[PDB]
Short mmCIF file of C-alpha atoms and ligand atoms in Angstrom, two decimals:
data_model
loop_
_atom_site.label_atom_id
_atom_site.label_comp_id
_atom_site.label_asym_id
_atom_site.label_seq_id
_atom_site.Cartn_x
_atom_site.Cartn_y
_atom_site.Cartn_z
CA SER M 23 -9.50 12.63 20.49
CA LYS M 24 -7.20 12.00 17.71
CA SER M 25 -8.17 12.38 14.08
CA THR M 26 -7.98 9.40 11.69
CA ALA M 27 -4.67 11.42 10.14
CA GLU M 28 -3.05 11.74 13.68
CA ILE M 29 -3.58 8.10 14.66
CA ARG M 30 -2.08 6.90 11.21
CA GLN M 31 1.10 9.17 12.14
CA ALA M 32 1.16 7.90 15.82
CA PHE M 33 0.93 4.41 14.81
CA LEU M 34 4.14 4.71 12.45
CA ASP M 35 6.01 7.33 14.98
CA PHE M 36 5.90 4.37 17.49
CA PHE M 37 7.26 1.80 15.11
CA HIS M 38 9.94 4.20 13.93
CA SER M 39 10.72 4.96 17.53
CA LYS M 40 11.31 1.62 18.13
CA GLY M 41 13.77 1.09 15.06
CA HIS M 42 11.22 0.05 12.09
CA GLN M 43 11.75 1.46 8.68
CA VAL M 44 8.86 3.45 7.54
CA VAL M 45 8.32 2.36 4.03
CA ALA M 46 5.26 4.10 1.80
CA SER M 47 2.09 2.22 1.18
CA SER M 48 2.33 0.18 -1.91
CA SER M 49 -0.22 0.52 -5.06
CA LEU M 50 -3.50 -1.51 -4.82
CA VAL M 51 -2.39 -3.08 -7.85
CA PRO M 52 0.87 -5.57 -8.42
CA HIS M 53 2.86 -5.45 -11.06
CA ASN M 54 5.11 -8.58 -10.06
CA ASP M 55 2.53 -10.98 -8.08
CA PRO M 56 0.15 -13.05 -10.45
CA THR M 57 -1.86 -14.47 -7.96
CA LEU M 58 -3.00 -11.38 -6.40
CA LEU M 59 -5.83 -9.43 -7.55
CA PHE M 60 -6.12 -6.58 -5.33
CA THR M 61 -3.57 -5.81 -2.55
CA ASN M 62 -5.42 -7.01 0.67
CA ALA M 63 -2.93 -6.62 3.49
CA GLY M 64 0.39 -4.56 4.30
CA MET M 65 2.38 -7.90 3.97
CA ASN M 66 1.90 -8.00 0.18
CA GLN M 67 4.66 -6.05 -0.83
CA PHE M 68 6.93 -7.42 1.07
CA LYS M 69 5.92 -11.35 0.19
CA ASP M 70 9.16 -12.14 -1.26
CA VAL M 71 11.12 -10.66 2.04
CA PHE M 72 8.83 -13.52 3.83
CA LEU M 73 9.90 -15.99 1.21
CA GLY M 74 13.45 -15.03 1.95
CA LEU M 75 13.78 -14.33 -1.77
CA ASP M 76 14.53 -10.96 -1.30
CA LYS M 77 16.45 -8.73 1.41
CA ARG M 78 16.09 -5.36 2.30
CA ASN M 79 18.42 -3.13 3.97
CA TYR M 80 16.11 -3.16 6.88
CA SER M 81 15.39 -6.02 9.16
CA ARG M 82 11.92 -4.39 10.49
CA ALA M 83 9.52 -2.26 8.94
CA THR M 84 6.42 -0.23 9.57
CA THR M 85 3.35 1.05 6.88
CA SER M 86 0.19 2.38 6.45
CA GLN M 87 -1.43 0.30 3.52
CA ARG M 88 -4.16 1.02 1.42
CA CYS M 89 -6.17 -2.31 0.75
CA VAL M 90 -8.91 -3.39 -1.03
CA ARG M 91 -10.83 -6.57 -0.02
CA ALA M 92 -13.37 -7.20 -2.61
CA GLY M 93 -12.13 -10.36 -4.49
CA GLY M 94 -9.74 -12.89 -4.59
CA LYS M 95 -8.87 -14.72 -1.06
CA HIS M 96 -10.10 -11.81 1.34
CA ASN M 97 -13.55 -10.44 0.11
CA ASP M 98 -15.78 -8.27 2.23
CA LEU M 99 -17.77 -6.55 -0.45
CA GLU M 100 -20.84 -8.31 0.91
CA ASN M 101 -20.61 -7.15 4.09
CA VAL M 102 -20.20 -3.40 3.58
CA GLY M 103 -23.24 -1.42 4.86
CA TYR M 104 -24.35 -4.64 7.04
CA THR M 105 -21.97 -4.21 9.59
CA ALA M 106 -19.98 -1.43 11.50
CA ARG M 107 -16.58 -2.76 10.77
CA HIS M 108 -16.33 -3.93 7.10
CA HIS M 109 -15.15 -2.02 4.40
CA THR M 110 -13.97 -2.79 0.56
CA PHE M 111 -11.22 -0.13 0.86
CA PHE M 112 -9.71 0.24 4.32
CA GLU M 113 -6.13 1.26 5.49
CA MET M 114 -4.15 -1.44 7.52
CA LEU M 115 -1.46 -0.26 10.11
CA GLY M 116 1.49 -2.66 10.10
CA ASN M 117 4.65 -3.51 11.79
CA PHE M 118 6.80 -6.54 10.24
CA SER M 119 10.18 -8.38 11.49
CA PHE M 120 11.79 -10.03 8.53
CA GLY M 121 13.82 -12.75 10.73
CA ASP M 122 14.52 -10.03 13.53
CA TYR M 123 12.14 -10.45 16.67
CA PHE M 124 9.78 -12.98 17.12
CA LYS M 125 6.40 -13.81 19.12
CA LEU M 126 7.14 -12.20 22.65
CA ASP M 127 8.20 -8.84 21.30
CA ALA M 128 5.47 -8.63 18.57
CA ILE M 129 3.07 -9.09 21.20
CA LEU M 130 4.77 -6.72 23.81
CA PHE M 131 5.00 -4.02 20.99
CA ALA M 132 1.30 -3.93 20.35
CA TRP M 133 0.13 -4.04 23.81
CA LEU M 134 2.48 -1.35 24.63
CA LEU M 135 1.41 0.86 21.91
CA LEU M 136 -2.58 -0.16 22.84
CA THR M 137 -2.57 0.42 26.42
CA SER M 138 0.25 2.21 27.46
CA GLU M 139 -0.05 5.67 29.25
CA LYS M 140 2.06 7.18 26.90
CA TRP M 141 0.44 5.69 24.27
CA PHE M 142 -3.18 4.87 22.96
CA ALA M 143 -3.81 4.20 26.77
CA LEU M 144 -7.00 1.84 25.94
CA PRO M 145 -8.66 0.44 28.90
CA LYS M 146 -6.94 -2.87 29.40
CA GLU M 147 -10.32 -4.59 30.93
CA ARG M 148 -11.86 -4.05 27.51
CA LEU M 149 -9.45 -6.08 25.12
CA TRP M 150 -9.53 -9.77 24.56
CA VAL M 151 -7.06 -11.80 22.72
CA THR M 152 -7.61 -15.24 20.78
CA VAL M 153 -4.68 -17.58 19.66
CA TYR M 154 -4.61 -20.44 17.50
CA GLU M 155 -5.34 -23.39 19.70
CA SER M 156 -2.09 -25.15 19.41
CA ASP M 157 -0.11 -22.20 19.63
CA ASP M 158 0.71 -22.90 23.52
CA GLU M 159 3.60 -20.21 23.34
CA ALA M 160 1.23 -17.21 22.27
CA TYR M 161 -1.59 -18.27 25.09
CA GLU M 162 1.37 -18.33 27.77
CA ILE M 163 3.00 -14.87 26.55
CA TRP M 164 -0.57 -13.19 26.75
CA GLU M 165 -1.24 -15.17 30.14
CA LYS M 166 2.21 -14.76 32.09
CA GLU M 167 4.35 -11.94 29.93
CA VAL M 168 1.55 -9.74 29.67
CA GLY M 169 -0.75 -10.73 32.22
CA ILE M 170 -4.37 -11.00 30.39
CA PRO M 171 -6.84 -12.74 32.61
CA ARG M 172 -7.26 -16.26 31.10
CA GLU M 173 -10.85 -15.61 30.97
CA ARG M 174 -10.32 -13.00 28.17
CA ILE M 175 -7.72 -15.39 26.31
CA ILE M 176 -9.56 -17.43 23.73
CA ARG M 177 -8.05 -20.38 21.87
CA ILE M 178 -9.21 -20.81 18.54
CA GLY M 179 -8.91 -24.04 16.31
CA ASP M 180 -9.50 -24.72 12.67
CA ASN M 181 -12.84 -23.43 12.94
CA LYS M 182 -13.45 -22.85 9.32
CA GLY M 183 -14.03 -26.57 8.76
CA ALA M 184 -10.52 -27.56 7.24
CA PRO M 185 -7.12 -27.79 8.18
CA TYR M 186 -5.55 -24.40 8.68
CA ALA M 187 -8.53 -22.67 8.17
CA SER M 188 -9.11 -20.68 11.10
CA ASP M 189 -9.67 -17.05 12.03
CA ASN M 190 -6.19 -17.72 14.11
CA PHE M 191 -4.05 -19.19 10.98
CA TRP M 192 -3.88 -16.09 8.54
CA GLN M 193 -3.23 -16.94 4.46
CA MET M 194 -2.10 -14.46 2.15
CA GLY M 195 -3.88 -16.59 -0.30
CA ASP M 196 -4.35 -19.97 -1.75
CA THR M 197 -0.43 -19.88 -2.00
CA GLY M 198 1.91 -17.58 -0.01
CA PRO M 199 3.25 -16.72 3.34
CA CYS M 200 0.94 -17.91 6.01
CA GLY M 201 1.17 -18.63 9.71
CA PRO M 202 -0.67 -19.13 12.87
CA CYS M 203 -1.81 -15.70 14.58
CA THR M 204 -3.16 -13.71 17.39
CA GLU M 205 -5.58 -11.30 17.37
CA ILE M 206 -6.72 -8.31 19.77
CA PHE M 207 -10.54 -7.61 20.33
CA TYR M 208 -11.98 -4.51 21.72
CA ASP M 209 -15.41 -4.88 23.68
CA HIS M 210 -17.30 -1.72 22.67
CA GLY M 211 -19.82 -2.45 25.36
CA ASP M 212 -23.38 -4.01 26.28
CA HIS M 213 -25.26 -1.53 24.23
CA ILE M 214 -24.10 -3.24 21.33
CA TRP M 215 -25.31 -6.51 20.28
CA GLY M 216 -22.73 -9.41 20.17
CA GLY M 217 -20.41 -11.99 22.19
CA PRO M 218 -16.98 -12.34 22.41
CA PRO M 219 -14.83 -14.61 19.82
CA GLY M 220 -15.44 -18.42 19.90
CA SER M 221 -19.08 -17.39 21.11
CA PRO M 222 -22.40 -18.11 19.19
CA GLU M 223 -22.65 -14.29 18.68
CA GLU M 224 -19.00 -13.62 17.92
CA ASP M 225 -20.11 -12.13 14.81
CA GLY M 226 -21.60 -9.00 16.32
CA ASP M 227 -20.16 -5.52 16.30
CA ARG M 228 -19.41 -5.47 20.00
CA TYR M 229 -16.30 -7.14 20.40
CA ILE M 230 -14.52 -6.03 17.34
CA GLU M 231 -10.93 -7.60 15.67
CA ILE M 232 -8.66 -4.79 16.09
CA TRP M 233 -5.00 -6.06 15.69
CA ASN M 234 -3.84 -9.04 13.90
CA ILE M 235 -0.51 -10.25 14.75
CA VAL M 236 0.97 -13.26 12.37
CA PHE M 237 3.67 -15.47 12.91
CA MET M 238 4.59 -16.35 9.41
CA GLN M 239 5.84 -19.79 9.46
CA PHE M 240 4.89 -21.33 6.19
CA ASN M 241 4.40 -21.16 2.01
CA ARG M 242 1.38 -22.47 1.34
CA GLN M 243 1.15 -24.54 -2.09
CA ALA M 244 -1.65 -24.45 -4.15
CA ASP M 245 -2.29 -28.56 -3.43
CA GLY M 246 -2.68 -27.19 0.17
CA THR M 247 1.02 -28.11 1.39
CA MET M 248 2.73 -26.07 4.03
CA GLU M 249 6.45 -25.58 3.25
CA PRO M 250 8.28 -23.71 5.93
CA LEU M 251 9.68 -20.05 5.53
CA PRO M 252 13.65 -19.84 5.72
CA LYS M 253 13.31 -17.69 9.09
CA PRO M 254 10.01 -17.33 11.12
CA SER M 255 8.68 -13.86 10.69
CA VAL M 256 6.29 -11.45 12.16
CA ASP M 257 3.74 -9.65 10.04
CA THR M 258 0.71 -7.75 11.74
CA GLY M 259 -2.00 -5.51 10.85
CA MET M 260 -4.53 -3.36 12.36
CA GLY M 261 -7.53 -1.67 10.87
CA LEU M 262 -6.98 2.28 11.02
CA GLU M 263 -10.71 2.96 10.79
CA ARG M 264 -11.63 0.54 13.79
CA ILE M 265 -8.64 1.64 15.93
CA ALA M 266 -10.03 4.99 14.82
CA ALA M 267 -13.53 4.19 16.19
CA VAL M 268 -12.12 2.85 19.70
CA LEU M 269 -10.21 6.17 19.90
CA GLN M 270 -12.83 8.55 19.03
CA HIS M 271 -15.12 6.93 21.23
CA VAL M 272 -17.81 5.68 18.81
CA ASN M 273 -18.50 2.26 17.90
CA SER M 274 -18.70 2.17 14.12
CA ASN M 275 -16.33 2.93 11.93
CA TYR M 276 -18.81 5.25 9.68
CA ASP M 277 -18.79 7.67 12.88
CA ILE M 278 -15.00 8.41 12.77
CA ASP M 279 -14.17 11.63 11.76
CA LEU M 280 -13.04 10.62 8.07
CA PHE M 281 -16.71 9.24 7.32
CA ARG M 282 -18.88 11.62 9.16
CA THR M 283 -17.26 14.12 6.86
CA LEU M 284 -17.83 11.80 3.73
CA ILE M 285 -21.15 10.83 4.62
CA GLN M 286 -22.41 14.47 4.60
CA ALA M 287 -20.75 14.92 1.12
CA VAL M 288 -22.66 11.90 0.05
CA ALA M 289 -26.09 13.16 1.39
CA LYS M 290 -25.10 16.57 -0.28
CA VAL M 291 -24.61 15.21 -3.79
CA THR M 292 -27.49 12.77 -3.83
CA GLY M 293 -30.06 14.97 -2.04
CA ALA M 294 -30.48 12.70 0.66
CA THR M 295 -31.57 13.87 4.37
CA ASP M 296 -31.52 10.75 6.62
CA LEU M 297 -27.81 10.46 7.58
CA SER M 298 -28.84 7.18 9.02
CA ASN M 299 -29.61 5.55 5.48
CA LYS M 300 -27.34 2.23 4.86
CA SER M 301 -26.80 3.72 1.16
CA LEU M 302 -25.28 6.71 2.42
CA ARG M 303 -22.63 4.26 3.84
CA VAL M 304 -22.28 2.32 1.30
CA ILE M 305 -21.56 4.86 -1.37
CA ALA M 306 -19.11 5.89 1.19
CA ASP M 307 -17.41 3.09 1.56
CA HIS M 308 -17.55 2.63 -2.50
CA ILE M 309 -16.07 5.98 -3.48
CA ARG M 310 -12.73 4.98 -1.48
CA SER M 311 -12.33 1.97 -3.44
CA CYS M 312 -13.28 2.90 -6.50
CA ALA M 313 -11.37 5.89 -6.48
CA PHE M 314 -7.86 4.69 -5.48
CA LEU M 315 -8.42 1.59 -7.84
CA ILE M 316 -8.70 4.09 -10.63
CA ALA M 317 -5.66 6.14 -9.27
CA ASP M 318 -3.43 2.82 -9.01
CA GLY M 319 -3.91 2.26 -12.75
CA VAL M 320 -7.42 0.16 -12.82
CA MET M 321 -10.02 1.11 -15.92
CA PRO M 322 -13.50 -0.24 -15.61
CA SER M 323 -13.91 -3.10 -18.32
CA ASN M 324 -15.99 -6.48 -18.47
CA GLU M 325 -12.72 -8.58 -17.40
CA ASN M 326 -10.62 -9.57 -14.46
CA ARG M 327 -9.70 -6.28 -12.56
CA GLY M 328 -11.43 -3.92 -14.36
CA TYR M 329 -14.71 -5.69 -14.15
CA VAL M 330 -14.66 -5.76 -10.39
CA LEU M 331 -13.87 -1.95 -10.49
CA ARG M 332 -17.09 -1.53 -12.86
CA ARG M 333 -19.03 -3.95 -10.55
CA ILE M 334 -18.38 -1.46 -7.33
CA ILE M 335 -19.01 1.55 -9.33
CA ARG M 336 -22.40 0.32 -10.75
CA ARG M 337 -23.27 -0.61 -7.21
CA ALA M 338 -22.56 2.56 -6.00
CA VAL M 339 -24.76 4.53 -8.74
CA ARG M 340 -27.35 2.03 -8.11
CA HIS M 341 -27.53 3.00 -4.09
CA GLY M 342 -27.32 6.64 -5.32
CA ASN M 343 -30.60 5.77 -7.49
CA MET M 344 -32.41 4.43 -4.11
CA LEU M 345 -31.44 7.55 -2.21
CA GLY M 346 -33.07 9.61 -5.29
CA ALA M 347 -30.07 10.94 -6.81
CA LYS M 348 -31.38 13.05 -9.67
CA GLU M 349 -28.21 13.64 -11.73
CA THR M 350 -24.48 11.95 -12.24
CA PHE M 351 -23.27 12.05 -8.52
CA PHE M 352 -20.46 9.70 -7.83
CA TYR M 353 -17.47 11.64 -9.70
CA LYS M 354 -18.42 14.73 -7.13
CA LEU M 355 -17.01 12.60 -4.30
CA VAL M 356 -13.73 12.61 -5.26
CA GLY M 357 -12.88 16.08 -3.97
CA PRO M 358 -14.26 15.57 -0.56
CA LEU M 359 -12.58 12.04 -0.31
CA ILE M 360 -9.19 13.92 -1.03
CA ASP M 361 -10.33 16.16 1.71
CA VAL M 362 -10.32 13.39 4.41
CA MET M 363 -7.80 10.98 3.49
CA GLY M 364 -4.53 13.33 4.15
CA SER M 365 -1.16 12.41 2.89
CA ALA M 366 -2.58 8.77 2.25
CA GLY M 367 -4.73 10.53 -0.29
CA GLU M 368 -1.61 12.11 -2.49
CA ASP M 369 -1.96 9.50 -5.11
CA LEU M 370 -5.57 10.49 -5.71
CA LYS M 371 -4.93 13.60 -5.24
CA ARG M 372 -2.43 13.75 -7.97
CA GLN M 373 -5.05 12.37 -10.21
CA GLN M 374 -7.79 13.97 -9.25
CA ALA M 375 -9.05 15.24 -12.74
CA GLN M 376 -8.32 11.75 -14.55
CA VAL M 377 -10.35 9.94 -11.81
CA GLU M 378 -13.69 12.30 -11.87
CA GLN M 379 -13.43 11.58 -15.60
CA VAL M 380 -13.56 7.89 -15.46
CA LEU M 381 -16.16 7.85 -12.59
CA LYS M 382 -18.17 10.45 -14.67
CA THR M 383 -17.98 8.38 -17.69
CA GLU M 384 -18.83 4.68 -16.24
CA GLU M 385 -21.93 6.43 -14.17
CA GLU M 386 -23.10 8.10 -17.38
CA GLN M 387 -22.72 4.69 -19.23
CA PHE M 388 -24.47 2.87 -16.93
CA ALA M 389 -27.40 5.54 -16.65
CA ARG M 390 -28.45 4.34 -19.99
CA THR M 391 -29.71 1.14 -19.05
CA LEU M 392 -29.89 1.57 -15.05
CA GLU M 393 -33.40 3.07 -14.43
CA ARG M 394 -34.97 0.70 -17.33
CA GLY M 395 -33.25 -2.62 -15.81
CA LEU M 396 -34.50 -1.38 -12.51
CA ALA M 397 -38.01 -1.01 -14.08
CA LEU M 398 -37.77 -4.73 -15.29
CA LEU M 399 -36.75 -6.38 -11.90
CA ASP M 400 -39.42 -4.37 -10.04
CA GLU M 401 -41.96 -5.71 -12.77
CA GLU M 402 -40.47 -9.25 -12.23
CA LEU M 403 -40.44 -9.07 -8.46
CA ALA M 404 -43.99 -8.04 -8.36
CA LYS M 405 -45.22 -11.17 -10.01
CA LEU M 406 -42.46 -13.20 -8.14
CA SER M 407 -43.94 -16.47 -6.45
CA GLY M 408 -41.60 -17.63 -4.10
CA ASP M 409 -38.17 -15.96 -2.65
CA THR M 410 -35.94 -16.51 -5.04
CA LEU M 411 -35.54 -14.67 -8.68
CA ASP M 412 -34.98 -16.86 -11.51
CA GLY M 413 -31.43 -17.30 -13.06
CA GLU M 414 -33.26 -16.42 -16.85
CA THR M 415 -34.23 -12.87 -15.24
CA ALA M 416 -30.67 -12.39 -13.44
CA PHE M 417 -29.19 -13.27 -16.70
CA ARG M 418 -31.51 -11.11 -18.71
CA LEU M 419 -30.61 -8.27 -16.65
CA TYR M 420 -26.84 -9.10 -17.04
CA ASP M 421 -27.10 -9.23 -21.04
CA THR M 422 -29.53 -6.89 -21.85
CA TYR M 423 -29.06 -4.07 -18.81
CA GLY M 424 -25.32 -4.57 -17.95
CA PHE M 425 -26.28 -5.36 -14.61
CA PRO M 426 -23.49 -7.70 -12.58
CA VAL M 427 -25.49 -10.54 -11.05
CA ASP M 428 -24.05 -9.31 -7.57
CA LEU M 429 -25.57 -5.94 -8.32
CA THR M 430 -28.96 -7.74 -9.09
CA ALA M 431 -28.57 -9.77 -5.95
CA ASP M 432 -27.94 -6.53 -3.80
CA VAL M 433 -31.01 -5.01 -4.91
CA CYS M 434 -33.10 -8.46 -4.17
CA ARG M 435 -31.40 -8.63 -0.81
CA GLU M 436 -32.95 -5.61 0.39
CA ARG M 437 -36.52 -7.13 -0.10
CA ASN M 438 -35.58 -10.33 1.38
CA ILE M 439 -35.39 -11.94 -2.37
CA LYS M 440 -32.42 -14.45 -3.18
CA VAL M 441 -31.20 -14.85 -6.85
CA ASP M 442 -30.67 -18.20 -8.38
CA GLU M 443 -27.12 -18.13 -8.96
CA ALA M 444 -26.88 -21.58 -10.39
CA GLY M 445 -30.01 -20.55 -13.12
CA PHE M 446 -27.65 -17.66 -13.78
CA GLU M 447 -24.89 -19.67 -14.41
CA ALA M 448 -26.52 -22.16 -16.33
CA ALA M 449 -27.84 -19.21 -18.82
CA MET M 450 -24.19 -17.99 -19.00
CA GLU M 451 -22.97 -21.43 -20.01
CA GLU M 452 -25.95 -22.07 -22.41
CA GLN M 453 -25.19 -18.84 -24.20
CA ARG M 454 -21.35 -19.56 -24.25
CA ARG M 455 -22.06 -22.93 -26.09
CA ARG M 456 -24.27 -20.76 -28.70
CA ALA M 457 -20.80 -18.58 -29.06
CA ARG M 458 -19.12 -21.60 -29.38
CA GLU M 459 -21.23 -23.32 -32.13
CA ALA M 460 -21.84 -20.14 -34.03
CA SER M 461 -17.97 -19.58 -34.19
CA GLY M 462 -16.72 -22.96 -35.10
CA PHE M 463 -13.40 -24.26 -34.66
N1 G5A Y 515 -1.69 -9.58 7.17
C1 G5A Y 515 -2.40 -9.87 8.37
C2 G5A Y 515 -3.94 -9.22 7.91
O1 G5A Y 515 -4.09 -9.05 6.97
N2 G5A Y 515 -4.44 -9.53 9.07
S1 G5A Y 515 -5.95 -9.21 9.18
O2 G5A Y 515 -6.84 -9.86 7.98
O3 G5A Y 515 -6.97 -9.72 10.28
O4 G5A Y 515 -6.46 -7.88 8.86
C3 G5A Y 515 -5.58 -6.98 9.66
C4 G5A Y 515 -6.85 -6.08 10.36
O5 G5A Y 515 -7.55 -4.95 9.37
C5 G5A Y 515 -8.90 -4.80 9.41
N3 G5A Y 515 -9.83 -5.57 8.41
C6 G5A Y 515 -9.49 -6.47 7.92
N4 G5A Y 515 -10.28 -6.48 6.84
C7 G5A Y 515 -11.06 -5.33 7.23
C8 G5A Y 515 -12.18 -4.68 5.82
N5 G5A Y 515 -12.71 -5.07 5.15
N6 G5A Y 515 -12.45 -3.63 6.56
C9 G5A Y 515 -11.98 -2.88 7.38
N7 G5A Y 515 -11.12 -3.23 8.47
C10 G5A Y 515 -10.69 -4.49 8.00
C11 G5A Y 515 -8.83 -5.56 10.81
O6 G5A Y 515 -8.95 -4.56 11.99
C12 G5A Y 515 -8.27 -6.67 10.86
O7 G5A Y 515 -7.80 -7.12 12.59
#
């Protein structure tokens, strides 16, 4: 089967052969978008093109975009290690039409790449599609132009409980380009738990969302209103890791060549032997987001972007502790990461030493309180009555030991214990009030 690197290249070669300009991945950190925490989609760097505010010399493009979904609109941090399909850091394979072609050709390009004997040659019978319930045009295209049996074409409405809140209406953020979308799913087989999209068991890892094709139609305003974009356009994204899993005949993203090698490296540096422990997968995921974020300019801090980075690093270090790592380990995974990323790791390779030192320093800093804080948490959990850690304790772990509340919640979750988030926030607010009273005007 093809390597992850070969799949990345083949995707780009396909679209290039179809006249799409190959454009380099943007950074994970925007310089000119105040609404965006980290790059969460291939379309981010083309936002102004979709808005009609910018025009490129090309009207169609293709990229393999590094994305982090660990905050803001699209945040999958709490899914990591609990599913076979979710990462913080991942590559999104995309094609884009800037007032060029539209619905039919977008769908045809995707179906051709996926199912043609000349291309990925996926078994057509294992592919399912969803359309936005009101998108009769997309439904007809799949049914009559492509020829998907009706039983595998699923209509999805506003299933997220609000207008335009839907798995089939994609939004860049609370504001920005958005529109109805159609998604392609692959059935990994009945040996995996789960049902098809729209079903009660849709959330299982059996039927995996591979490729989202967005028909960009609106610019969402903060008040929730939808202003039409000047030219209906196309924004698509396919998870490189998810399509690699399909192509490499495995079911989990973590079983692709890239992650198998990386997970072996995690075992080596932590001293773990059971290659099935979920902490190995969590750490393998986390080094990707942490290392690339630092390469793209983020420094650990207690505010904004720096704090999200700090939170992920510390959670990774905590998982290393659970695995029994005896010495500083996280920075040692940068080399191994560079080795599996191919050309997509060039920005990280360029700054290897710098990224390693930032990670080493952060882990060493956290180690000043990690074990002591875990000791306290164990003490408090041992005498805890009920299923919920009190907010005062969570806040003490935060204030004294530098445990982000989500790190505390992560440890507790592994023991089926919840954290009183409201209580934590009340304690934080009480401290804010003390700070105000003491500081004065
Ligand atoms: N602009 C259009 C769009 O963004 N669409 S989409 O939000 O759906 O993401 C595009 C795709 O990237 C993959 N993907 C998304 N999130 C993750 C994640 N946390 N981990 C791994 N793969 C993911 C997934 O295969 C998916 O269909």
